Every structure is written in structure tokens, then in C-alpha cells.
Write a protein that binds this ligand. Sequence first.
Ligand SMILES: OC[C@H]1O[C@@H](n2c[nH+]c3c2N=CN[C@H]3O)[C@H](O)[C@@H]1O
Ligand SMILES: [Zn+2]
Length: 349
Amino acid sequence: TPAFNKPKVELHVHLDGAIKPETILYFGKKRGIALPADTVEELRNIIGMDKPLSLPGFLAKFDYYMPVIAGCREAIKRIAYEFVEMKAKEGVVYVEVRYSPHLLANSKVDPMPWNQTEGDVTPDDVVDLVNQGLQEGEQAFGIKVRSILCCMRHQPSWSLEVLELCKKYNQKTVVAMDLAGDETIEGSSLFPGHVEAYEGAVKNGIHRTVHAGEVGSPEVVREAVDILKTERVGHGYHTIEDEALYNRLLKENMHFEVCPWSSYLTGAWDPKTTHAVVRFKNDKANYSLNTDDPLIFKSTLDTDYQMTKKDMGFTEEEFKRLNINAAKSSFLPEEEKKELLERLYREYQ
Ligand SMILES: OC[C@H]1O[C@@H](n2c[nH+]c3c2N=CN[C@H]3O)[C@H](O)[C@@H]1O
Ligand SMILES: [Zn+2]
């Protein structure tokens, strides 16, 4: 039985980290592009991981399959459509999917991702492609789906373009901007391209979220809050290491996008210590339960729910509480956010 068989809200899940192993094999074979496995089962086991590594070690899993999707219009729209079908099956009624448009493009991107040969798929085109797949999935499965464009920590020169994309496709699925990738790159939050992208988002009203405190120190979280001006913190487990900052953000009703199973495999969470989400629960903090990268973690949303339930002591009450919280902290407009809350209260009776 699912740990929580009722409607859910997900705010932290990556599109390029939520692809069907079957769809990956399809395009690898179709484009004649090398894959580390020839069957969907072998493919799952090599792309996937079931024991802790590091953030850089986990990020390396993308190198295996991205080449097969990147630069292929048909593939881009297909994974967006299929993502919606995956989530609907999980009991998710509203989802925000994040991804980097540049990492899927093969035209007007520098440096060229995955050694691709120049093509005509621009970062803009991929956003439009994802919009179409997500819209068709919304129509076909009856769940509300939005997107978040990711700035990449190591490539700040793409950040202002990501911002312009968020502006251009505002609410056309695109509801916010994120900062993702390798948090171990010292001071990456403060690169000028990133900083300028976010400041312009504040002045233009584009919503903001940032991965921080996943594997980085509380100072990375503080940088996200103070300089980048985030409205939500992706992961944020390490915040608790600085009592003052934690109690400040807690007092400020800051939303934490928690990914339980994910934190275990990236090493963000030391299994020898009590998970931060337990303290978040005990303090009644504003947080959500997320999958992050279900393809690589060989998981599903129920994975995270069982984890917190069997271990950690979560109840049905908290599950409803954190989901109403996730709905309130969504980057959805007031009219649509109101409709979502009506839905949860209706189905939580
Ligand atoms: O979705 C865009 C990118 O975000 C990065 N990503 C995915 N999961 C994570 C992540 N970066 C940091 N932490 C993780 O939650 C990947 O490099 C993927 O290519
Ligand atoms: Zn993430």
C-alpha cells in the first residue's frame, strides 16, 4: 500500500532526470548513438544507483544518456509528455518540472553540450518543445504542470538567457528560475552572471528557487537568501548547522524542497545522523517531499513517502500538512493556487 494514497504536490523534480529507460533506448538505437547498456534492464542498473556517492559522482550519470535526447526535437517533446503521464500515475495533481534548456540544445549554445554536432535546436526551441509536451500531458492526464528553467552553476554565461526565457514564456508552463548543478564549486552562487540573472528576476517579478545546503555549507544557503533572493530553498538540509540562520528562515516561513531518498544517494544526508526533515517536521517548518531525479535514483514519489514514514515517524496528518504547504508555496498565480488548495481540501476529507 502506498504510504500516502492521496493527491500530492511536487516542487522539485528534474525533467532530464525523469526519463523512461525505454525512451532512452529508443532514441539511442534510432540515432545510432552509443549507450552504456543495450537492454532497458541493464540500462536501469548502470544509469541508476542504490548506494551513496557524491554530488559530482551522481551528476556524471547524465553523461550516459543526455546525448541521445539532446538536439532531438521529437525526443524533447516526448519526455515532457511522458513525464506528465508518470506523475499522474503517482497521484500528483500539480507539478513543477525543472530543467536546463541549454543542456538539451545543439544550436546557439557555447560551449556545445555533449560534443554534439551543430544543429538547429536552440535553447529557445527546447523550451517551446517542452511547453508543448507538458501542455499535451496536462490535457491528456488532467493534472496541472508547470516548468522551471535551470541556470547551471558552472556556466554563468547562460544565466541571463535563462532569465529572458523565463520572461518570454511566463506562465506558458514557465513559472520560475533555478540554480542547479555542482554545489561543490566554491563560490559558484556568487558568479556575476548568476547574480545578475537573479537580481533582474527580482526587479521583473520572475519567481526564484536555488539548490543550497544540499552538500554545501549554511553559507551557501545564506548566499541564496541574501544575494540571490530565493523564495524557496532546494534541499537546504545543512541550514540547521547554523542555528541563527535556520531559526531566521523558519521564522520567515521559508519553503524547503526536501528530497529524502535523493539526499541519501548524493551523500547530502549522513545516514549516521537524524535526517534534517525530522527537525523540520518537529518545528513544523514549511517544506515539501520530492523525488528530484527518479530515473537515477530508481525511485518514485512513494519511495520518499515510505522512507519518511517507516523511518522518521511521519503520519497522514503531516503528509497533508506538507502538501498544503507546497501548494501555498507554489509559483502558481493566486487564482490557480486557490483552485489547487480547493482541490486538496476537497480530496483530504
Ligand atoms: O535539470 C538540470 C540539471 O540539474 C542538475 N541536477 C539534477 N539533480 C540535481 C542537480 N543539481 C544539484 N542537485 C541535484 O538535486 C543536473 O546537472 C541536470 O542536468
Ligand atoms: Zn535537484
